[PDB]
C-alpha cells in the first residue's frame, strides 16, 4: 500500500539521480566539444536552462519530487489519482524536453547521449510504475456513485433525460473554458 509506493519512490529517486548525473556528463561533453558556451550564472535562479541542461535536470527532479509527494498523499487520502497522473504528465513533459534538447544539441554517437536516453526511459518507466502502484493502492481507483434511475411518469423520465443532457452540455462547455484557462496559464508562465 504505502510501502510499495515508497519502494517505487526510492526507484524514482535513484532513476532521477542517474538522470542528473547523465545530464551533468552531457553538459561536460558539450563544453569540451564547444557545442554551447558555459556561462555558470544562475539566470532566473534555477530557471529552465541557466548554465544549460543541468538546470532542466534540476526542474525535472523538482517535478518528480512533487510526484513523490503526490504519491504520499495518494496513500494518505489527500490526493486523487488524476492529481498523481497530472504530476506524472508534468514529469514526462520535463524529461522529454530535456532529452530532445540534449539530442539536438549533442553528437548522436556521444556516450552521454546514450546514457541520457537510457536514464530518461528509466525515469519514465519508473514513474509509470509508481503511478500504477499508487492508483492500485488508492481505494478510489474504481468507484462510481452513478446508478440506474428511472421514473414511471412520462414527464419524470423525460425530465431525467433533459437534465442529464444539460449536465452533459454544461460540463463540455466548462471543459472548453478550462482548456482555455490552462492555455492562458501556460502562456503567462512563459512568453519569451
Amino acid at each position: 500500500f504505502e510501502e510499495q509506493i515508497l519502494e517505487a519512490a526510492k526507484s524514482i529517486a535513484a532513476a532521477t539521480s542517474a538522470l542528473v548525473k547523465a545530464a551533468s556528463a552531457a553538459q561536460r561533453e558539450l563544453v569540451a566539444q564547444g557545442k554551447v558556451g558555459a556561462i555558470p550564472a544562475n539566470a532566473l535562479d534555477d530557471g529552465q536552462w541557466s548554465q544549460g541542461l543541468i538546470s532542466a535536470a534540476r526542474m525535472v527532479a523538482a517535478a518528480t519530487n512533487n510526484l513523490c509527494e503526490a504519491a504520499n498523499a495518494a496513500v494518505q487520502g489527500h490526493a486523487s489519482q488524476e492529481k498523481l497522473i497530472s504530476s506524472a504528465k508534468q514529469v514526462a513533459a520535463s524529461t522529454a524536453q530535456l532529452l530532445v534538447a540534449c539530442k539536438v544539441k549533442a553528437d548522436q554517437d556521444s556516450e552521454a547521449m546514450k546514457r541520457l536516453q537510457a536514464a530518461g526511459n528509466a525515469v519514465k518507466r519508473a514513474s509509470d510504475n509508481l503511478v500504477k502502484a499508487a492508483q492500485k493502492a488508492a481505494a478510489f481507483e474504481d468507484q462510481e456513485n452513478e446508478t440506474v434511475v428511472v421514473k414511471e411518469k412520462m414527464v419524470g423520465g423525460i425530465a431525467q433525460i433533459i437534465a442529464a443532457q444539460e449536465e452533459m452540455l454544461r460540463k463540455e462547455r466548462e471543459l472548453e473554458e478550462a482548456r482555455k484557462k490552462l492555455a492562458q496559464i501556460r502562456q503567462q508562465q512563459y512568453k519569451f
Binding site: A92, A93, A96, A101, R179
Partner: protein, 373 residues
C-alpha cells in the same frame, strides 16, 4: 523506446494527424469551425458555442462553417488553435507536451504564419520540440526518391518544387493559388447553369462531395465537349442529402479543366502542366532529364481519374520528344505528404533537426527561420 513523434499535416481543407512510424494517418477530418446561426429554443440542446471537425460536418444544416486556413495561410488563429486542440485531445487523444511535433507548410508562405505556428505550439501546447517541413519534400520522401519535381495540389495551394539528389532549387519553386477549393467554387458557379443553386457553406460541402465523386480530367477537352454535346453517356446522376437527384454532364470534366486552364476562373496564370514545365526549365540543363523522368504528384486535388494521363500528354507536347516523361501517381498520394512526414519523423538523422524549447526560449520565434527551410 524513444517517444514517437506527432505528424500533423494541417492542409487548407483537411487535417491529417497520426504517429511517427505508422503507414496511414490516424485522424483525417475536415479543418472547419462551425458556429450556430439560428436561435436556440429548446434548453436541452443548443448550448455549445462551436463545433470542430466531423461534428460540424454532421451539423452543417444549422451552422456557418469557416475554414481557418485560406490559401495555405492561417487567417483565424483562434479557430486554428481550436482545431489543434480538437486534434490533440479528441482525435489523437494524446498529451502534446510529450511528443515532438512535425508540422507542414506550403513554400513561399508568409513568415509571420510560421512564426505564429511556432509560438502557439511552444507557448500554448508546450510541445518538447517542433519542426516545420515543406510538403513537397515530404511527398518526395514518401515516394522513396531523392530526385524529382513534386506537384503538390492541396485544397488551397498548388506548388511545384524540383529536388535533385536531395538538393532543392528555391528559385525554381512555383506556387499557384488555384487549388481544390477554387475548383469547388467554379463547380458551384457552373452548376448554377443547370438550375441547381448552391449558396450556403453546407451547400459548398455538398458540391465538394459532388466534385470528389463525379468529376474527372478529360484526355482531350474539345473532344470531350463534342462527345458530351452529341451523346448523354457522360451524364451522371447524384442524390442530394434531401433526396433530390441532380444530373450533370460536361461539368464532370469542365471543373477539373480549370487546373489546366485557369482562365476559366479569370486567373492569368498558366495551367499546372505549364507551371511544371517552366519549373523544370528554370533548373540546370544537366538535371532536366531526371526531373522529366520523375514527375511526382501528391495531394487530394491530383486524385481525379485520368489526371496523370492528361499531365503526361501535356508535358510530352511541351518537352522535347527525346526526353522520357513519367508521371508517378501512387494510389495513396492523397496522404503522401503525411506519409513522408512519418518517414521523416522516424529517421535517426532527423532527430538532431528538432527545434527544441531551449532554442525557442533563448532565440524566440525567429529561430524557425534558421533551422527550417
Amino acid at each position: 523506446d524513444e517517444t514517437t513523434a506527432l505528424v500533423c499535416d494541417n492542409g487548407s481543407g483537411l487535417v491529417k494527424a497520426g504517429f511517427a512510424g505508422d503507414d496511414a494517418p490516424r485522424a483525417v477530418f475536415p479543418s472547419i469551425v462551425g458556429r450556430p446561426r439560428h436561435q436556440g429554443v429548446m434548453v436541452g440542446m443548443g448550448q455549445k458555442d462551436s463545433y470542430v471537425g466531423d461534428e460540424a460536418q454532421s451539423k452543417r444544416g444549422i451552422l456557418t462553417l469557416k475554414y481557418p486556413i485560406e490559401h495555405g495561410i492561417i487567417t483565424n488563429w483562434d479557430d486554428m488553435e481550436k482545431i489543434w486542440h480538437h486534434t490533440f485531445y479528441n482525435e489523437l487523444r494524446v498529451a502534446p507536451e510529450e511528443h515532438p511535433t512535425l508540422l507542414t507548410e506550403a513554400p513561399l508562405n508568409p513568415k509571420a504564419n510560421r512564426e505564429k505556428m511556432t509560438q502557439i505550439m511552444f507557448e500554448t501546447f508546450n510541445v518538447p520540440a517542433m519542426y516545420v517541413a515543406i510538403q513537397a519534400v515530404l511527398s518526395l520522401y514518401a515516394s522513396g526518391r531523392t530526385t524529382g519535381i513534386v506537384l503538390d495540389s492541396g485544397d488551397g495551394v498548388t506548388h511545384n518544387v524540383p529536388i535533385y539528389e536531395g538538393y532543392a532549387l528555391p528559385h525554381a519553386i512555383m506556387r499557384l493559388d488555384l487549388a481544390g477549393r477554387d475548383l469547388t467554387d467554379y463547380l458551384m458557379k457552373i452548376l448554377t447553369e443547370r438550375g441547381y443553386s448552391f449558396v450556403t457553406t453546407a451547400e459548398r460541402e455538398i458540391v465538394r462531395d459532388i466534385k470528389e465523386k463525379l468529376c474527372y480530367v478529360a484526355l482531350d477537352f474539345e473532344n470531350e465537349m463534342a462527345t458530351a454535346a452529341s451523346s448523354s453517356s457522360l451524364e451522371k446522376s447524384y442524390e442530394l442529402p434531401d433526396g433530390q437527384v441532380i444530373t450533370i454532364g460536361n461539368e464532370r470534366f469542365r471543373c477539373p479543366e480549370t487546373l489546366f486552364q485557369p482562365s476559366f476562373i479569370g486567373m492569368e496564370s498558366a495551367g499546372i502542366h505549364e507551371t511544371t514545365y517552366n519549373s523544370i526549365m528554370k533548373c540546370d540543363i544537366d538535371i532536366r532529364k531526371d526531373l522529366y523522368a520523375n514527375n511526382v504528384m501528391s495531394g487530394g486535388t491530383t486524385m481525379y481519374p485520368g489526371i496523370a494521363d492528361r499531365m503526361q500528354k501535356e508535358i510530352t507536347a511541351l518537352a522535347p520528344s527525346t526526353m522520357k516523361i513519367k508521371i508517378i501517381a501512387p494510389p495513396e498520394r492523397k496522404y503522401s505528404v503525411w506519409i513522408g512526414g512519418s518517414i521523416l519523423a522516424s529517421l535517426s538523422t532527423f532527430q538532431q533537426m528538432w527545434i527544441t524549447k531551449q532554442e525557442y526560449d533563448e532565440a524566440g520565434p525567429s529561430i524557425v527561420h534558421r533551422k527550417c527551410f
